[PDB]
Design an enzyme around this catalytic site. Sequence first.
Site, short mmCIF file in Angstrom:
data_model
loop_
_atom_site.label_atom_id
_atom_site.label_comp_id
_atom_site.label_asym_id
_atom_site.label_seq_id
_atom_site.Cartn_x
_atom_site.Cartn_y
_atom_site.Cartn_z
CB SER A 72 -7.36 16.31 1.63
OG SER A 72 -7.29 15.37 0.58
N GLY A 126 -6.09 13.00 -0.21
CA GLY A 126 -7.27 12.34 -0.71
C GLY A 126 -7.28 12.28 -2.21
CG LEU A 133 -10.57 36.61 -2.47
CD1 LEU A 133 -11.11 35.51 -3.37
CD2 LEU A 133 -10.09 36.03 -1.15
N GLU A 157 -5.64 41.40 -2.55
CA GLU A 157 -4.68 41.95 -1.62
C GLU A 157 -3.74 40.88 -1.10
N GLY A 201 -13.95 17.22 -0.95
CA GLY A 201 -13.44 16.13 -0.16
C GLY A 201 -13.84 16.17 1.28
CD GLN A 202 -13.28 12.31 6.06
OE1 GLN A 202 -13.76 11.30 5.56
NE2 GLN A 202 -12.48 12.28 7.12
N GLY A 262 -9.93 15.04 -2.96
CA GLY A 262 -9.26 16.24 -2.55
C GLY A 262 -8.08 16.68 -3.38
CB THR A 308 -1.54 9.34 6.31
OG1 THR A 308 -1.17 9.16 7.68
CG2 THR A 308 -1.41 10.81 5.94
C1 LIG Z 1 -11.19 -3.00 6.51
O1 LIG Z 1 -9.82 -3.26 6.29
C2 LIG Z 1 -8.92 -2.23 6.56
C3 LIG Z 1 -8.42 -1.52 5.46
C4 LIG Z 1 -7.52 -0.46 5.63
C5 LIG Z 1 -6.96 0.28 4.40
C6 LIG Z 1 -5.45 0.74 4.58
C7 LIG Z 1 -4.41 -0.23 4.43
C8 LIG Z 1 -3.08 0.16 4.59
C9 LIG Z 1 -2.76 1.49 4.91
C10 LIG Z 1 -3.76 2.46 5.07
C11 LIG Z 1 -5.13 2.10 4.91
C12 LIG Z 1 -6.27 3.20 5.12
S1 LIG Z 1 -6.32 4.59 3.84
C13 LIG Z 1 -6.51 6.30 4.43
N1 LIG Z 1 -6.87 7.25 3.51
C14 LIG Z 1 -7.00 8.53 3.95
C15 LIG Z 1 -6.79 8.88 5.28
C16 LIG Z 1 -6.42 7.84 6.16
N2 LIG Z 1 -6.28 6.56 5.74
C17 LIG Z 1 -7.68 2.58 5.11
C18 LIG Z 1 -8.92 3.45 4.83
O2 LIG Z 1 -9.85 2.56 4.22
C19 LIG Z 1 -9.24 1.43 3.84
O3 LIG Z 1 -9.84 0.43 3.40
C20 LIG Z 1 -7.77 1.54 4.01
O4 LIG Z 1 -1.36 1.57 5.01
C21 LIG Z 1 -0.77 0.36 4.54
O5 LIG Z 1 -1.87 -0.55 4.50
C22 LIG Z 1 -7.12 -0.12 6.95
C23 LIG Z 1 -7.63 -0.83 8.05
O6 LIG Z 1 -7.23 -0.47 9.34
C24 LIG Z 1 -6.00 0.24 9.45
C25 LIG Z 1 -8.54 -1.88 7.86
O7 LIG Z 1 -9.04 -2.59 8.93
C26 LIG Z 1 -8.14 -3.57 9.43
N1 LIG Z 2 -7.41 18.02 9.46
C1 LIG Z 2 -8.26 17.18 8.89
N2 LIG Z 2 -7.72 16.27 8.03
C2 LIG Z 2 -8.56 15.38 7.44
C3 LIG Z 2 -9.94 15.38 7.67
N3 LIG Z 2 -10.47 14.36 6.92
C4 LIG Z 2 -9.46 13.76 6.24
N4 LIG Z 2 -8.29 14.36 6.59
C5 LIG Z 2 -6.96 14.12 6.06
O1 LIG Z 2 -7.17 14.14 4.66
C6 LIG Z 2 -6.37 13.17 4.03
C7 LIG Z 2 -7.23 12.21 3.22
O2 LIG Z 2 -8.01 13.02 2.38
P1 LIG Z 2 -9.62 12.98 2.37
O3 LIG Z 2 -10.11 14.42 2.28
O4 LIG Z 2 -10.17 12.26 3.58
O5 LIG Z 2 -10.01 12.05 1.09
P2 LIG Z 2 -11.01 12.50 -0.08
O6 LIG Z 2 -10.69 13.81 -0.71
O7 LIG Z 2 -12.48 12.40 0.21
O8 LIG Z 2 -10.58 11.39 -1.18
P3 LIG Z 2 -11.26 9.91 -1.30
O9 LIG Z 2 -12.00 9.46 -0.02
O10 LIG Z 2 -10.07 9.08 -1.74
O11 LIG Z 2 -12.29 10.09 -2.40
C8 LIG Z 2 -5.62 12.45 5.14
O12 LIG Z 2 -4.30 12.92 5.13
C9 LIG Z 2 -6.30 12.83 6.45
O13 LIG Z 2 -5.31 13.17 7.38
C10 LIG Z 2 -10.49 16.33 8.54
O14 LIG Z 2 -11.71 16.39 8.77
N5 LIG Z 2 -9.63 17.22 9.15
MG LIG Z 3 -13.73 10.46 0.85
#
Ligand SMILES: COc1cc([C@@H]2c3cc4c(cc3[C@@H](Sc3ncccn3)[C@H]3COC(=O)[C@H]23)OCO4)cc(OC)c1OC
Ligand SMILES: Nc1nc2c(ncn2[C@@H]2O[C@H](COP(=O)(O)OP(=O)(O)OP(=O)(O)O)[C@@H](O)[C@H]2O)c(=O)[nH]1
Ligand SMILES: [Mg+2]
Lengths: 317, 424, 54, 433
Positions: free
Chosen positions: D140, D143, D252, D254, D10-11, D146, D179
Amino acid sequence: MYTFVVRDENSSVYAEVSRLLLATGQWKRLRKDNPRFNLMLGERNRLPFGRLGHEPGLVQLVNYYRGADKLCRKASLVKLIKTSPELSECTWFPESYVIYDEREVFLAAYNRRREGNVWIAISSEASDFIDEQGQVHVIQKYLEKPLLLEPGHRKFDIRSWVLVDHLYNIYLYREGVLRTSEPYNSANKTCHLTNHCIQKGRYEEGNEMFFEEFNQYLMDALNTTLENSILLQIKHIIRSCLMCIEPAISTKHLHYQSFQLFGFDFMVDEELKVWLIEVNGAPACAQKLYAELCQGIVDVAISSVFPLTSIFIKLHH
Amino acid sequence: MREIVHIQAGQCGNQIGAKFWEVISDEHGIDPTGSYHGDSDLQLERINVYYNEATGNKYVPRAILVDLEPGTMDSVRSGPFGQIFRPDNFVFGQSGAGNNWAKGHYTEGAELVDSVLDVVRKESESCDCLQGFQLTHSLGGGTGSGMGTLLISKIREEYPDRIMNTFSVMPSPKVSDTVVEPYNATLSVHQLVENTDETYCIDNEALYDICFRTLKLTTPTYGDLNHLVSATMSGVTTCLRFPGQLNADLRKLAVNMVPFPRLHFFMPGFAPLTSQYRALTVPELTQQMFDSKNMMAACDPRHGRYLTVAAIFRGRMSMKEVDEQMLNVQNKNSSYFVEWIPNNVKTAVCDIPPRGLKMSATFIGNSTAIQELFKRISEQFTAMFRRKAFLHWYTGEGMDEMEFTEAESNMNDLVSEYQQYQDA
Amino acid sequence: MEVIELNKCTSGQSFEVILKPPSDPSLEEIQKKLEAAEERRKYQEAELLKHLAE
Amino acid sequence: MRECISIHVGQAGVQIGNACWELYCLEHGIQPDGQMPSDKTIGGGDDSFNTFFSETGAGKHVPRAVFVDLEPTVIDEVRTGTYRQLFHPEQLITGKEDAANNYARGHYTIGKEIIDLVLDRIRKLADQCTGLQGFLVFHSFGGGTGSGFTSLLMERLSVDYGKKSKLEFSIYPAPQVSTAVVEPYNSILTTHTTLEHSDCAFMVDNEAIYDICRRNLDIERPTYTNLNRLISQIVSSITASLRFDGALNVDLTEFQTNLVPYPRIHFPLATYPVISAEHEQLSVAEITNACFEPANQMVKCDPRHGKYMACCLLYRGDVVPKDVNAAIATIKTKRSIQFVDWCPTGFKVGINYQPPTVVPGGDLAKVQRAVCMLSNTTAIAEAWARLDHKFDLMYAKRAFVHWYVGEGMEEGEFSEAREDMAALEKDYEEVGV
Ligand SMILES: COc1cc([C@@H]2c3cc4c(cc3[C@@H](Sc3ncccn3)[C@H]3COC(=O)[C@H]23)OCO4)cc(OC)c1OC
Ligand SMILES: Nc1nc2c(ncn2[C@@H]2O[C@H](COP(=O)(O)OP(=O)(O)OP(=O)(O)O)[C@@H](O)[C@H]2O)c(=O)[nH]1
Ligand SMILES: [Mg+2]
Ligand SMILES: Nc1ncnc2c1ncn2[C@@H]1O[C@H](COP(=O)(O)OP(=O)(O)CP(=O)(O)O)[C@@H](O)[C@H]1O
Ligand SMILES: Nc1nc2c(ncn2[C@@H]2O[C@H](COP(=O)(O)OP(=O)(O)O)[C@@H](O)[C@H]2O)c(=O)[nH]1
Ligand SMILES: [Mg+2]
């Protein structure tokens, strides 16, 4: 504008506190279980401390210190005083033993006192009324020689209200209350309990004496003052009990912050000596006092974190 | 996933779609000929999402233009950025649809639909990973309304695992072309409830009002409305076209905006409403953005409750101010946000602002207040249906009153569901 | 008080200071679960496409 | 020798791994090219650094690592990054479509399509290993990849590498620092499915990291980079023992032995000075006490209100046993470190003398000594409570559940998982009070 929530509908005190918070035009009650609050007036039981301090960009304050139970449960208080180095084994807490255990010791003592010895859980022969009853309990030395309010030969207890803000400043409300007992009888048995409950109004309205009359009574019958004869020892006892547990309940560097209003209960014996009876965590108030105290709770405990002659004595910085 | 496929159907559809391609082509530095001529790399990092790269740098909008009448699409070929579009991708009939849902959906549209789907295949098959499709249309006419929904079904049959997304213009008596608009709308709302993952509800009523009683334009033209529309479309497509923290996809949006499958009808909002030498303050943008006088629907959010919200902030500003103001809007009005979806307002920031503006804020809401829009339409529909008026235009196309009856019920139900959650 | 198990090395020290003494699935099973989810996804797709065909 | 294979899923993990490995390279003196001037044993060496880095005839030291994400980006950066030369193509494995923050999609739908490939690449690495201790998995909780792929990989790893140990470095979801809305769900699900496939997991709450990055480093809006760099440091502290000479946590195994009382109670709380370069040097005592400041923890909890069952102190820099012991005493008197009645109350101490490294241009100041404390407090259960509660709020209305059922899952998994978490919270409540 600040937001708060209410989660103890029985708290007379914080019922009033919420009423004035609203009456300031800058506070707004949310529904219980809304997370995004500035202040919590939480429940007395199983308060979710593990959930405060994690709302992003929300400073959060709660009205109960987590851990103070150790001072507000009877057995816990006895354990605390006995095993704390800051509290010796002290001279202001009546000899106490916890039993469900510290059985032997109790007996040992009794003996040493039965060689020429009244206790409470009130009797004089080690007999128990605990096993033919409910929960954990504590056998405590009964104060057989109490200072009696003599235009009635009466028992009393003093109740003091102590506020601890988020900086762990300790404030004593200038107004305490005397809960006064039917005369006393060193042979027999309601009077002996000064509890208003039990009591239920001859000498005092609702068997309650405020501090002005107690002061005149000591001045006129005993040539001392409330401050000299008793309040120096009340302030000592409060400071001891509260500074003792501070390292274990302080919210100094915590993700959330705590304040709390305690009610200390003291007895005075005939040598003008103050003894700690019990610390109460969720106290009520004397009705005439409800107005003043609650305002001070908003003045020094709430608006100190959430900004918008003093009725308190600073025992602590 | 990466590539989006864009579809314009009908007059209104092709108008707002053409504006959208002008606006974001400008944002991405693409001149009317398809040649990149911009400064930043940010403009080309995710350009693959909306543009197919071709020949000498040339970029071509992955767009399919669709209509049953040749007018609006000729208009488009002729006008600004007219020849950025692949000429093959103009798909048009001659008959027209006569603001008739039955015609676009069942009779005339059925002829044209297979040639549309042909172009759809050609574009989808040339994609590394197709996210899904974006459609622009009104729900009040005939081609966009009926043919568009028919396309939605066809495409879902052929790509059941991709994301269906629409900017759907709702009709309003204030801005009407025909009385049958409630029927057409109720019919396509039916389809949309079932076959799209996310529909941005662009209500002509609100665009009117914001043109009249805010931009203070006493006589608004469809261009006045469509500049609000293209501003919104740039806004809500930003995080899908630009790099950054929350690299967005259509699916994650859906996953994050749609708690329940049917309730996928969003309310967009934008600040500063234009028609600007002084850039505003974050506080300003924020409060403007959450006010109703900035909603593109018609509903007042103070009448229902936000299920989910996403905000996008474009320009150079302090992220600290953005977070403070966002939490201030919530913490202050925490009554209008449901407590059973924790942390439901997310925020993104992109440095590149829209044209003309230095700082801007777009907002997407799954709010229960959308029920108001649907209710409005339901009423209008009923009125007429109760006396079976103007139904002959549809019955003569093979339809039956039962269809209508069903549709109505469905929309009524939608409202109900929304309300159900407003009281939770 | 009690310090025990002191290992000294050119790059480290290690030791224990006491203060007060006391008082699986299967490739198959998994594959199965995975294949069950796969087929469940397929059923719903079927229902859809059928509905779509109607 | 006793090699440790590290998998970054994951990222979060990938990005964190990047950081970690960079630090590692700086710490061990390996250059981006893979060259470690210091290694006099060319093409080989059974030295300590070799537990994480293998070696080429050309003298390239290669990370024993696998980066895996279901989306090309991110890993692609690695592929085209400063340290790209260090890694090998097959080690970096990318997919085509993310999991849209859905465990189901990652664990099932998208996972099944790549699991074997990944597992294969790991074997490749395992085969180049003479004595695999086990794996270190970075991921994560919120994710989809993740949570989902991680859970699957775990299960499988527990099948294809049974007797080997698996340690985790997980990112707990924090409202800030981005998140999704379903991270709570994804988190509980992955925990349920991984609980018995992990021997020791180190949870890191982004909230805590954020705060520290904001407070102790004066960064208004911390970036993932800012945060990951800090996290890496902590990881280093925890991973140093295996990469340098020493006698604490050199295997590990330990870790568990010294930190994990019963198999399920396997989540140690970690505490780490974090200063900006702008010079008051801190003292063993001072830093050790911070280890008991709740603000310096990776997970925000009030240990005091909870009981200890194990505590290890890992120092890095100018630190001598005496100073340590002294500090301990003092702290003991002052602070409240209550243990469970069935545990010894001692502190297991280790010191690597190799001083801490900073990433150049980073926000952390180079320091003369540091400490990472690892404790087993029943208090960590608070972080489960929060998650559990959020999960409950949503699950009672079945919100978003359709996105998972539509991918193959059954509402049951949710409940099973929740119940498992309910069980966990109790276990803690027991060992505690
Ligand atoms: C282009 O449209 C958009 C789309 C989104 C959505 C979305 C919508 C939600 C929400 C969260 C999210 C997050 S998910 C996420 N996963 C892991 C770590 C952090 N975040 C976005 C990521 O990619 C997306 O498409 C998601 O809480 C309730 O409603 C968000 C945008 O800005 C805020 C946008 O631009 C206006
Ligand atoms: N501390 C830290 N948190 C991260 C980072 N990247 C993502 N996060 C956190 O990781 C959570 C989202 O998980 P990700 O690892 O980004 O998602 P992923 O595993 O690639 O899953 P998908 O994109 O859904 O395929 C969120 O709660 C973010 O706060 C990072 O580089 N550092
Ligand atoms: Mg990802
Ligand atoms: N050791 C002792 N000697 C004499 N009287 C004692 C005593 N311990 C308790 N009492 C009496 O018992 C009465 C009841 O107080 P106690 O602390 O025992 O129960 P309680 O919890 O109801 C007090 P509150 O209602 O203020 O919390 C007191 O008013 C006091 O007169
Ligand atoms: N906002 C906006 N609405 C439009 C535009 N053109 C038509 N409408 C609305 O769309 C409906 C008419 O549909 P139209 O697009 O002309 O029909 P079609 O060609 O059959 O799909 C009515 O509700 C109009 O108010 C436009 O350019 N902008
Ligand atoms: Mg028209």
